[PDB]
C-alpha cells in the first residue's frame, strides 16, 4: 500500500484571451514539485526532487512537459470552438496523474481528468475514456483526441514505465524526510456549549508527522465516547494539527484528561489532565477579552 504519487494540474480559461495553468506534485503528503504559469521551468521543493534522474534525463522530461503545457492550452481553446453552443467559457480543468506504489516492485498508474469540478475522463490502457456519468457531448472530443496516436504512445510510456521508475527513485532519495517523526504538542481549552449549562472541552494537538494520530478524552482508563475528532489540518511547516472536543455538564470537567498516541512518542502517550498544574498556568497565558 503505502505511498501514492500525484501530479496535479489546474487549468482555467476565462475567455478566448485569458488562461493560466498551474501544477503541484505530491508524494504522500509532502510536496515535491512546483510549476506555475509564469515559470518556464519546474521547481524542486525538496532537495531530493530530481530523484534518480540525470540532469539529462530530467531536462528531457522537463522538455516534454514544457511543450505539452503550451500545446494543451491551445488545444483546449480549439475544443471550445469545436464545442460551440455546447460548451462555453469559463472553463476549469483539473488533472490528477500519479503512480501508486505497491510493495516492491509493483505499482498502479492513473490519469484522471475533471471538467468544471467533475470527474469525466480517464486514460485507460491505450486510449481516453469517458467515465460513467460524463456528459455525452465529450464523446466527439474524446474521438478527436484518441486519433492522435503519438500522444497516446507517449502517455503510455509515462504511465507504464516512467512514473514507477521515477518514484522508486524518489523513495530512496527522499527517504530521510519521508520517514521523519515530529512530536505533537497538546493544549486544552474550553468553550460554552450550545446546550445551556454545558461546556465544550477542546484538546489541541499540533505539529506531528507522520499523519496518523490517536486522540481521546478519558476519565481514568475509560474512554469517553462523546469525543469527536476534527479534520486534520495542515501546518505550514509540514506538520499536522488536529483537535478533539467533548461536551460536558459544567463541573464534570474534573477528572478528565486528553490522551494522545503517536509514532514519535513511541511508548509514552501524552496524558494531559484538566486542571493540571500546567493547564492552569498555560491557561493563564492565553487570557483575552473575547
Amino acid at each position, epitope marked *: 500500500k503505502n505511498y501514492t504519487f500525484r501530479c496535479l494540474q489546474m487549468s482555467s480559461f476565462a475567455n478566448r484571451s485569458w488562461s493560466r495553468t498551474d501544477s503541484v506534485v505530491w508524494l504522500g503528503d509532502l510536496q515535491t514539485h512546483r510549476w506555475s504559469n509564469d515559470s518556464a521551468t519546474i521547481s524542486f521543493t525538496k532537495p531530493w526532487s530530481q530523484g534518480k534522474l540525470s540532469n539529462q534525463q530530467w531536462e528531457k522530461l522537463q522538455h516534454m512537459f514544457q511543450v505539452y503545457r503550451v500545446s494543451f492550452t491551445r*488545444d483546449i481553446q480549439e*475544443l471550445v*470552438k469545436m464545442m460551440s453552443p455546447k460548451e462555453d467559457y469559463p472553463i476549469e480543468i483539473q488533472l490528477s496523474a500519479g503512480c501508486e506504489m505497491y510493495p516492491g516492485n509493483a505499482s498502479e498508474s492513473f490519469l484522471h481528468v475533471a471538467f468544471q469540478g467533475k470527474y469525466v475522463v480517464r486514460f485507460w490502457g491505450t486510449s481516453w475514456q469517458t467515465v460513467p456519468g460524463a456528459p455525452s457531448w465529450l464523446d466527439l472530443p474524446i474521438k478527436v483526441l484518441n*486519433a*492522435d496516436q503519438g*500522444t497516446s504512445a507517449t502517455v503510455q510510456m509515462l504511465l507504464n514505465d516512467t512514473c514507477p521508475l521515477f518514484v522508486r527513485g524518489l523513495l530512496e532519495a527522499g527517504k530521510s524526510d519521508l520517514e521523519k517523526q515530529e512530536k505533537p504538542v497538546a493544549w486544552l481549552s474550553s468553550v460554552p456549549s450550545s446546550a445551556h449549562g454545558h461546556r465544550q472541552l477542546v484538546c489541541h494537538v499540533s505539529g506531528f508527522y507522520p499523519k496518523p494520530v490517536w486522540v481521546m478524552w478519558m476519565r481514568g482508563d475509560q474512554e469517553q465516547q462523546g469525543t469527536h475528532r476534527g479534520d486534520f489540518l495542515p501546518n505550514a511547516d509540514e506538520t499536522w494539527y488536529l483537535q478533539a472536543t467533548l461536551d460536558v455538564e459544567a463541573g464534570e470537567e474534573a477528572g478528565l484528561a486528553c490522551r494522545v498516541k503517536h509514532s514519535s512518542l513511541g511508548g509514552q502517550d501524552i496524558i494531559l489532565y484538566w486542571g493540571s498544574l500546567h493547564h492552569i498556568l498555560d491557561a493563564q497565558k492565553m487570557v483575552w477579552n473575547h
Partner: T-cell receptor, first 113, second 114 residues
C-alpha cells in the same frame, strides 16, 4: 519563416534525379508532407511522413524526414517534364484535427529536355 | 471518394467591390479552410470552420468574411477589393478523425480591374 525550402528554384535535365529541401522550426512537429502544385492549379499530395526517422515513397517520389534535424528531403527519380510544377513542404503541429498546418514558400522546378 | 471544388475558377473585380466565392466538398469532412497564396510567401489561413454555421478567423482574417452555410459548403467573401490587386484563393477541407486527410481545391484566381 518557420518552414524553409531551398533552392528557391531548381533546374534539372530530364531523366536526371533531383533533390529538394525543407528545414523547419515549428513545434510540435507531428508530421511533414510534400505537395506538388501545377500552375493554375491546386495542391496534390505526394508523400506524408510521420515518424522520427521515416521514409516514404509514392511512385517516382521519395522523401525522408529527420525529426531530430528538423529536416526533410524529397527525391524525384528519373524526372519527367510533368515534374516542373512547384513543390511545397508543410508541417503539421498536432496529431489530432485540432492542429494547424505550416506552409513553406515552395521550390519551383524547371525540367529541361 | 469526392471532389472539393471552388467556384469560380476565375474572378473579375473592381476596386471596392465585394466578391464572394464558394467551396464544395463531398468527402463528409467537417473542417474547411480558406487560404491565400501570395507568390513566394506560402499559404496563410484566412478563415476556418468546424461545421455550419461556424467560422474561426485565420491569421489573415481581417478584410474578409466567411460563412459556413452547411456541412458541404463554405463561402468566403471579400469585403472590398483592392486596385491592381491580383490574388489566388484556395479551399481545403479536413477530417476531424485524421489530421492527415486534407484535400485541396484547384483554386480561384482573381483580377481586379479599375
Amino acid at each position: 519563416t518557420q518552414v524553409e525550402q531551398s533552392p528557391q528554384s531548381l533546374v534539372v535535365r530530364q531523366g536526371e534525379n533531383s533533390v529538394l529541401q525543407c528545414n523547419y522550426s515549428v513545434t510540435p512537429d507531428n508530421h511533414l508532407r510534400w505537395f506538388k502544385q501545377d500552375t493554375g492549379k491546386g495542391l496534390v499530395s505526394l508523400t506524408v511522413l510521420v515518424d522520427q526517422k521515416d521514409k516514404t515513397s509514392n511512385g517516382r517520389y521519395s522523401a525522408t524526414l529527420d525529426k531530430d534535424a528538423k529536416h526533410s528531403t524529397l527525391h524525384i527519380t528519373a524526372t519527367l517534364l510533368d515534374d516542373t510544377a512547384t513543390y511545397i513542404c508543410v508541417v503539421g503541429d498536432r496529431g489530432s484535427a485540432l492542429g494547424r498546418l505550416h506552409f513553406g514558400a515552395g521550390t519551383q522546378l524547371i525540367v529541361i529536355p | 471518394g469526392g471532389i472539393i471544388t471552388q467556384t469560380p475558377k476565375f474572378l473579375i473585380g473592381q476596386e471596392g467591390q465585394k466578391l464572394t466565392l464558394k467551396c464544395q466538398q463531398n468527402f463528409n469532412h467537417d473542417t474547411m479552410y480558406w487560404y491565400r497564396q501570395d507568390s513566394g510567401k506560402g499559404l496563410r489561413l484566412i478563415y476556418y470552420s468546424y461545421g455550419a454555421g461556424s467560422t474561426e478567423k485565420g491569421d489573415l482574417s481581417e478584410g474578409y468574411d466567411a460563412s459556413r452555410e452547411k456541412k458541404s459548403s463554405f463561402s468566403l467573401t471579400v469585403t472590398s477589393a483592392q486596385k491592381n490587386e491580383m490574388a489566388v484563393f484556395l479551399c481545403a477541407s479536413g477530417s476531424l478523425l485524421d489530421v492527415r486527410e486534407v484535400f485541396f481545391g484547384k483554386g480561384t484566381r482573381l483580377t481586379v480591374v479599375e
